[PDB]
Amino acid sequence: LHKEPATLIKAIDGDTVKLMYKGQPMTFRLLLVDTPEFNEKYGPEASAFTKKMVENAKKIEVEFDKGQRTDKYGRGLAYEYADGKMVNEALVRQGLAKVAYVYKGNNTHEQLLRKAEAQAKKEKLNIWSED
Template sequence: MNNKNKKILNQLNNRQSRNKLKKLGLPGIILIIIIAAASYYFTEDSPADEDRTEVTVDHYIDGDTTRFYYNGQSESFRYLIIDTPELNTSTGDPEPFAVEAADRTQELLENAETIEVEFDVGPETDHHGRYLVYVYADGEMINERLVREGLASVRYLNPPNTSRQQQLEDAERLAKEEGLGIWSLE
């Protein structure tokens, strides 16, 4: 729950506020609920912004999967809403831009003083047991950076884990318009 909603709840628990609500009547109460819901869902910051957790890298897998030390042990983390080209294919050859995506992820994380992960509002893990997160290096979202540089596409939307979908789609649109990375092949 974000700070705005905590304030609203505290005010509603206040006796004076309850008396004011009685005076407002049902239409007034409905209006207050609508305003509170709109501020919750349409603010630039998602509720998850308050819940970033610092992690450290254990092992790089590829552009969109990294093993981080989390809660005292090494765990696999899959970057939400993005897909980078595959390093390991059935032919043995990486897909175009797979090496670049993996190298870029490693570069961004190695150069960061602080690495954080942010869970969305839905399930924390996928069917492979990997944690689903947005990854931040010194406050910058790596998921978005990879998409913006044409090293990842927007994919694997798993509602309700989609709070950053529009932000990532905007980055992808710009990368496509500029013909960057994977979009240079089209």
């Protein structure tokens, strides 16, 4: 896999963001993560997390996996990096998202995400606070 340049157009919510990619404005859906919707418990937190992380990042990068690059809605499917830090992993580590089911072979960072998740769960962070 390889990281590619992208530019923030607009933060959306926990697992989606509007970015410019190769000159085209696109909606990207974060691979392997499921964040609560905005008007759902932990949704405002998840949205504020990604917003802050991406809005203050000098360099935004997109890394497509080995599987399907776009879903049925035309959204780009990738691992998003803000100044070298993976947004997907950062969310799961904070207990603001759970690892999602693999979508069409995009599973390269599945173990890494599961490890970020396990630690969040062990620390009873946010979504895991009722375990």
